[PDB]
């Protein structure tokens, strides 16, 4: 379960890096904005302060969402249970 969290962590970083490069290049976003936008998209927050304006970007975003949402939320879940859960019990133990 310690290995679980480490595999999900790597795959999320790779997914986020892919988005940062694509949106920086094709949509012209500053890299920090491209990373921020990729995160806001794949967690489904979707503020819309940034959104793709090219047809290439729209098509990429469709696939990016379908491929990436399941991995990011897996990671959030494992981060929730296998890392954030115990530490709270640890601060409780009398």
Give the residue with the Cβ less far from Tl ion, 5 or 50: 50
Interaction mask 17-46, Tl ion, x per CB under 5 A: ---------------------------x-x
Please report whether residue 48 would count as binding Tl ion according to CB under 5 A.
yes
- The rounded distance, in Å, linking the Cα atoms of 42 and 58 is 14
Locate 30 and state its tokens.
């500053």
Say how many CA atoms lie within 13 Å of 88 toward its Cβ: 7
Give the residue with the Cβ less far from Tl ion, 31 or 46: 46
Closest contact distance (angstroms) between CB of 25 and a copy of itself is 19
How many CB atoms are closer than 10 A to CB 90? Answer: 8
């Amino acid at each position: 379960k310690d290995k679980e969290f480490q595999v999900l962590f790597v795959l999320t970083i790779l997914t986020l890096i892919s988005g940062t490069i694509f949106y920086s290049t094709v949509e012209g976003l500053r890299p920090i904005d491209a990373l921020y936008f990729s995160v806001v998209t794949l967690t489904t927050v979707g503020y819309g302060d940034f959104s793709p304006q090219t047809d290439f970007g729209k098509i990429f975003t469709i696939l990016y969402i379908f491929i990436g949402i399941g991995l990011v939320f897996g990671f959030i879940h494992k981060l929730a249970v296998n890392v954030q859960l115990p530490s709270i019990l640890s601060n409780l133990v009398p």
